């Protein structure tokens, strides 16, 4: 009964939420607040720079796993050939490559934990970690230990409860910010407009990702999906910061506020959107594969003509997928422009796509397991 396994996915979120308040050994917890630029609702939880930063054992979340996942996916796709041999193999392919990723996150956590603990000081005086080089390393260990469990949960809660655990853990972090509504009571006046606009963007995203290119294959349709997701904006954020790595020591044009910076920004959304989805979904691969086991696209010759067909299909299709994702990135500043708002809060962006995305993904997965007890039975 899905319900009795549902109890387990709320229980796994209960342990994730209870670990939110386990503090890092090196915090002076007073300074973690009053770094608060707003009211929090957390201990070890801040509102500053539009950020919910919760510095705790889970401070960096499953996030180091996702970055190791995208790096190894880029890594196997040439660069290193050793992962390419794992890529085409299978079973074994997911096994050793996810095992390598697993060890790549845990090493990436140590450096992300280190970087987060030092730069958090420059925010608060020059002060308040612990007794300041030996004692960082316990804070690289304890924070890496935070992701390690949080990684353990994901692969426990996917094989026990509802849909894939890493996606529901990320979804748990984004939605857990309900105090954002409390903090913003603050500033009936135009609130009707804000609530209509959050329902307007949740309908805009739901019309877009649930939309499907039918490509018939010979009552079996191979969907070209969605009009290609989050990995565009994260990719996009990288190049501005690298030429901007020059900031700390050796600038204004890369400023993300300025219109030289939104055009450089918006150009990179499109490129990283396009490229990633030129690869991630339906390159030459889905053509050369139809020839191995399968049929054809009706009326279209298999082989090169199929790869030319799906490529032209992809190109024209991807433009609207791309321009849709740039606009979900720049929406918060417009929402924050006419805003009733501080620069504290989630309203309008990639935070929402994951929230609506994991909601649909976990809703469709429930029912896939729920199809035993409806219309399995017959002739009676």
């Amino acid at each position, epitope marked *: 009964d899905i319900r009795n396994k549902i109890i387990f996915t709320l229980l796994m979120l209960i342990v994730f939420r209870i670990g939110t308040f386990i503090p890092v050994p090196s915090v002076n917890t*007073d300074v973690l*607040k*009053l770094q608060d*630029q707003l009211n929090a609702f957390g*201990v070890l939880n801040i509102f500053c720079g539009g950020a919910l930063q919760n510095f705790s054992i889970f401070a960096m979340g499953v996030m180091p796993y996702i970055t190791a996942s995208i790096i190894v996916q880029l890594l196997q796709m040439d660069v290193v050939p050793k992962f390419a041999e794992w890529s085409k193999q299978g079973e074994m392919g997911r096994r050793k490559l996810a095992q390598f990723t697993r060890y790549f996150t845990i090493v990436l956590g140590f450096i992300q934990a280190l970087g987060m603990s030092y730069g958090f000081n420059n925010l*608060a*005086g*020059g*002060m308040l970690i612990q007794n300041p080089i030996g004692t960082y390393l316990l804070i690289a260990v304890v924070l890496t230990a935070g992701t390690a469990f949080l990684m353990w949960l994901g692969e426990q809660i996917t094989a026990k409860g509802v849909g894939n655990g890493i996606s529901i853990i990320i979804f748990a972090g984004i939605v857990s910010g309900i105090p954002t509504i409390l903090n913003q009571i603050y500033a009936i006046v135009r609130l009707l407009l804000v609530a209509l606009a959050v329902v307007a963007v949740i309908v805009g995203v739901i019309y877009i990702q649930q939309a499907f290119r039918k490509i018939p294959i010979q009552s079996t349709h191979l969907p070209l999906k969605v009009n290609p997701v989050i990995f565009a904006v994260s990719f996009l954020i990288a190049p501005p910061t690298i030429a901007s790595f020059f900031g700390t020591n050796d600038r204004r044009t890369f400023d993300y506020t300025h219109p030289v910076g939104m055009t450089i920004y918006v150009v990179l959304i499109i490129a990283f959107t396009y490229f990633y989805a030129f690869v991630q979904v339906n390159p030459e691969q889905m053509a050369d594969n139809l020839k191995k086991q399968g049929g054809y696209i009706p009326g279209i010759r298999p082989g090169k003509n199929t790869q030319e067909y799906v490529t032209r299909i992809l190109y024209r299709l991807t433009l609207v997928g791309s321009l849709f994702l740039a606009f979900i990135a720049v929406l918060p500043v417009f929402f924050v422009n006419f805003a009733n708002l501080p620069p504290s809060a989630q309203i309008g962006g990639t935070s929402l796509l994951i929230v609506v995305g994991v909601a649909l993904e976990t809703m469709k997965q429930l029912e896939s397991q729920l199809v035993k007890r409806h219309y399995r039975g017959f002739i009676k």
Partner: nanobody
Amino acid sequence: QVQLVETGGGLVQPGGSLRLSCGASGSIFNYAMGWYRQAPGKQREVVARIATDDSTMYPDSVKGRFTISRDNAKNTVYLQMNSLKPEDTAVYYCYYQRTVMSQPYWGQGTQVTVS
């Protein structure tokens, strides 16, 4: 649990000194203790922090010029401010925590102006 009322602020020329006094009429203090400023155009930084062990921490900007100390019986913490500079101009707030039993408790601040 308690209330914090602080005093000892005022106007002084650079190089002068002052002593901030933070009283608690309800008195426990027997914790983690600090002073933070928050000038306008703002955000606050912790000026001094004294631990339950009586460990003492200051930021680099303040180092050696300020001294934090705690008076038993009547609940009071003292921020001794020496060699004041125009950068020190701000309202000064006294806060208490138990450390991880959570949140700091503010106080209505004392204005400090170095002219």
